[PDB]
Each structure stands twice: as structure tokens, then as C-alpha cells.
Amino acid sequence: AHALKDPWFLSYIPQLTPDTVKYDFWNKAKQALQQPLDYIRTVEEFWSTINSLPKLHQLGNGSTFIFARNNVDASYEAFPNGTRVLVDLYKASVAEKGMDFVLSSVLGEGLTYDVFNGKKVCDVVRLSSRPNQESPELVRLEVWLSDQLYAKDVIPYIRKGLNEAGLSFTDFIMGESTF
Numbered sequence: 001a002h003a004l005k006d007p008w009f010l011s012y013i014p015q016l017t018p019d020t021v022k023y024d025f026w027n028k029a030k031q032a033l034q035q036p037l038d039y040i041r042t043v044e045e046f047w048s049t050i051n052s053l054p055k056l057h058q059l060g061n062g063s064t065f066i067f068a069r070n071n072v073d074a075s076y077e078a079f080p081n082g083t084r085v086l087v088d089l090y091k092a093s094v095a096e097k098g099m100d101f102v103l104s105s106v107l108g109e110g111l112t113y114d115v116f117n118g119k120k121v122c123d124v125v126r127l128s129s130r131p132n133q134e135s136p137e138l139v140r141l142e143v144w145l146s147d148q149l150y151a152k153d154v155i156p157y158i159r160k161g162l163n164e165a166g167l168s169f170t171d172f173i174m175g176e177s178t179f
């Protein structure tokens with residue numbers, strides 16, 4: 001048992017699509033569909049959980065995994081000055097290598113000490129299945145930041161780390177969406 005800097009709570013939202021929300025209503029929809037999965041406290045639980053995750057593409061379009069630091073609410077409302085760094089991974093093979101890199105960088109405080117100078121700017125990581133006509137295995141990763149200013153630093157850091165983990169320029173695309 002080797003404790004993480006902070007424990008992270010893993011939740012699941014099945015087939016969370018904007019069209020399913022259109023009949024439901026966000027908090028009314030989130031609290032009604034969210035399923036608790038695990039409370040990750042140590043490195044050993046981190047790898048057990050990550051290596052046991054069911055494939056996002058075998059679950060519906062919009063199936064989402066949320067990793068929340070200290071079990072905080074993963075709401076747009078809670079991060080007014082924040083942003084979402086996006087990573088879209090095209091194939092199932094690259095999605096695993098990418099997901100492993102990003103989650104290890106976040107829960108392992110790699111981003112904290114390499115980019116944020118010791119500040120805990122990232123409190124949420126979201127993993128979504130988002131297949132489109134063109135790419136049916138497309139998985140989206142979201143690195144939620146409390147401060148938008150850090151996005152310019154997180155994007156090249158994540159790009160380099162994915163490239164180093166063996167992903168090519170065509171295996172993933174970097175993006176950003178504000179709150």
C-alpha cells in the first residue's frame with residue numbers, strides 16, 4: 001500500500017449524450033445516471049482499476065468515466081476560470097497507451113511537479129467514448145484545469161508524453177474547451 005497524494009473517486013455515466021439530456025432537462029441528469037465505481041487511494045489500486053476498465057467502445061456512445069480528486073463534483077460550475085485540455089484517440093490500441101499516460105501523469109502528480117510547479121491545478125479527468133461516422137473507436141480524454149493559463153503548458157507536455165509513450169501524430173489530436 002503506497003498512498004497517492006490525494007485519493008480519486010471513479011464514477012461512470014452510461015451513454016451520457018446531449019440528446020439524452022434533451023428529455024431529462026445538468027445536475028438532475030448527472031445525479032440520476034451516475035454510478036459509483038471505485039475509490040482509488042494507492043498506486044496498487046490505481047493499476048488494478050486502470051487495467052480492469054471495460055473497453056469504452058464496447059459501452060455506448062457517450063459512456064463516460066470520471067476521475068475526481070478528493071471525490072469533488074465534476075461540474076463546469078465548480079471551475080469558473082478553468083478549461084478542459086482534450087485528447088482524442090482514434091484506435092482502441094492507442095487509446096490504452098494514451099489513457100495510461102494521461103491518468104498516470106495526473107493521479108501520479110506528474111503534471112503537478114513538471115508543469116504546475118507543485119500546484120494541484122487538475123482535479124478531474126474524464127474518459128468518453130465518442131464514435132463518429134469517420135472514426136468508430138474514437139475515445140476522448142479531458143484534463144480539467146482550475147486555471148485556463150496552464151493550458152498552453154499542459155497541451156505540449158501531454159503531446160510530448162504521448163509521442164514518447166509511442167503514439168504518432170495521427171494517433172491522437174490535442175484540443176481545448178473552456179468552461
Ligand SMILES: C[n+]1cn([C@@H]2O[C@H](COP(=O)(O)OP(=O)(O)OP(=O)(O)O)[C@@H](O)[C@H]2O)c2nc(N)[nH]c(=O)c21
Pocket residue numbers: 016017018021026062074075076077128
Ligand atoms: C458534464 N456536463 C454535461 N453537461 C450537459 O450534458 C450534455 C452532454 O454531456 P457531455 O459531458 O457528454 O458533453 P461534452 O461537453 O463532453 O461534449 P461537447 O460539449 O459536445 O463537446 C452537454 O451537452 C451539456 O448540455 C453539463 N452542463 C453543465 N451546465 N454542466 C456540466 O458540468 C455538464
